[PDB]
Design a protein around this ligand. Structure first.
Ligand SMILES: COCC(=O)Nc1c(C)cc(C)cc1C
Ligand SMILES: COCC(=O)Nc1c(C)cc(C)cc1C
Ligand SMILES: [Zn+2]
Ligand SMILES: [Zn+2]
Ligand SMILES: [Zn+2]
Length: 457
């Protein structure tokens, strides 16, 4: 059971207002045929246009919500809405475009999907709340057949051009007019009571219903993200590397060791309460401190309430609390915090449910909306580099470093050595990588790097 059987049953009740008289008994095979496509008994990598919830989850980066609303349908104009906020009007002859024939609408669809998806995925998954018009409109912009490769590269073909009779991936599709071998999933097949807006609004207050097709496309995809990543969580699914995943993760580990090490050296807390991932390891193994761990999985729905995390019966007020990606409603004043900023624009961060974002880096993590009020008892952690390692080069040309934030014995002594200058510049690069990936760093108000200078005596 790798792919979705074309002989699987498809519930058609949601389709009968646009398509009156639709048979109750229906398979994906008959549905695809009714959509004007022909599968021709082809065992060439594309067994079905529709996919399972499990395949959809593995391909979350390819998700594009799609809705079609009849403005007046062979005789009537259709409004094509996508979760990118785009609305196109197709004539049979929140960005709104005026009525145009299918031959030009299809060119815009290819361009839009290609720019959105080229750095996210090898495919497109149309996420629907199917009522009929969206399925019957696909024949005007989609072509299907065997799996193919790009004419200019080795990636799989996602587009076709009738002008040159060629196939292309999302990176090489300029001027292509057809979407080739797209995938799709109907959210209505998952068993819901009531319409799209009533199910979406149960969990999300950030997406409204401005009554246009793109609003429904956005609500549709958001509801699918809620079901697959908020209410259901699977950390055993691995996602491919598409960007700076490894550098970002390495940078996070470097910054954590640095910040926690200097907080312990500057304020000498007797105990550190490490709250978060139950698989955490001490980030400063040589530190004197009493290291105590508290297990909390990443919260994917709402931030943890500090009262439920700390109360219900031990002394968190003693020493310092470390919340490394442990999203709480209000941090205590004695904290060291790393909190992901859901508003960050990146190829790793996908739009999520109710202000949250879906951060995909090896695993998918739905993260509650970033809230500046969580950090009221703390301040932003300033950049700094600290090193007690000896000044000794060993073993990439040089320019002398001058910086008030290079906290080393050589800078204290008046002149930064080559070793600490190379290490500072590498650390600053890792730091900038982590911040630009969306991570934010917060610290207890008494934290002062001036206290690190006397750790060299
Ligand atoms: C970060 O979590 C703080 C906290 O309250 N943890 C805790 C729990 C949950 C149960 C018992 C019996 C004891 C403690 C210290
Ligand atoms: C409950 O924690 C109260 C608090 O603010 N603790 C604190 C103290 C007392 C001294 C230093 C230098 C730093 C911290 C974080
Ligand atoms: Zn290509
Ligand atoms: Zn929503
Ligand atoms: Zn040095």
């Amino acid at each position: 059971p790798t792919h979705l059987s074309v002989d699987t049953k498809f519930k058609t009740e949601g389709l009968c207002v646009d398509i009156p008289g639709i048979p109750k008994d229906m398979t994906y095979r008959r549905l695809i045929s009714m959509m004007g496509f022909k599968m021709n008994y082809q065992v060439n990598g594309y067994p079905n246009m529709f996919i399972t919830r499990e395949e959809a989850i593995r391909h979350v980066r390819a998700w594009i919500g799609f809705d079609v609303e009849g403005c007046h349908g062979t005789n009537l104009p259709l409004q094509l809405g996508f979760s990118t906020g785009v609305n196109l009007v197709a004539v049979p002859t929140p960005l709104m475009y005026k009525g145009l024939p299918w031959n030009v609408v299809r060119i815009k669809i290819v361009q839009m999907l290609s720019d959105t998806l080229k750095n996210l995925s090898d495919r497109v998954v149309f996420v629907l709340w199917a009522h009929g018009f969206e399925l019957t409109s696909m024949k005007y912009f989609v072509k299907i057949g065997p799996e193919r490769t790009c004419c200019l590269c080795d990636r799989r073909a996602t587009c076709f051009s009738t002008a040159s009779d060629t196939y292309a991936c999302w990176h090489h599709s300029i001027g292509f007019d057809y979407v080739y071998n797209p995938f799709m999933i109907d959210v209505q097949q998952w068993g819901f009571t009531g319409n799209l807006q009533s199910n979406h609004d149960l969990y999300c207050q950030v997406h409204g219903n401005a009554h246009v097709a793109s609003c429904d496309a956005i609500m549709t995809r958001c509801l699918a993200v809620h079901e697959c990543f908020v209410k259901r969580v699977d950390w055993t699914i691995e996602y491919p590397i598409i960007g700076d995943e490894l550098k970002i993760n390495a940078a996070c580990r470097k910054v954590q060791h640095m910040v926690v090490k200097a907080a312990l050296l500057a304020d000498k807390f007797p105990v550190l309460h490490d709250i978060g991932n139950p698989k955490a390891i001490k980030c400063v193994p040589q530190a004197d401190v009493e290291w105590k761990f508290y297990d909390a999985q990443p919260c994917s729905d709402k931030a943890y309430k500090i009262e439920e995390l700390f109360y219900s019966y031990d002394k968190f007020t003693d020493g310092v609390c470390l919340f490394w990606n442990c999203n709480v409603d209000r941090y205590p004043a004695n904290s060291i915090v790393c909190r992901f900023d859901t508003r960050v624009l990146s190829n790793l961060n996908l739009p999520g449910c109710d202000g949250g974002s879906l951060y995909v880096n090896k695993h998918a993590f739905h993260t509650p909306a970033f809230d500046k009020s969580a950090f009221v008892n703390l301040k932003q952690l300033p950049f700094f580099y600290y090193s007690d390692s000896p000044c000794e080069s060993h073993g990439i040309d040089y320019v002398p470093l001058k910086s008030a934030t290079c906290i080393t014995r050589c800078n204290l002594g008046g002149a930064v050595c080559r070793h600490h200058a190379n290490e500072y510049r590498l650390y600053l690069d890792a730091y900038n990588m982590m911040i630009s990936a969306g991570f934010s760093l917060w610290v207890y108000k008494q934290f002062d790097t001036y206290n690190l200078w006397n750790t060299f005596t």
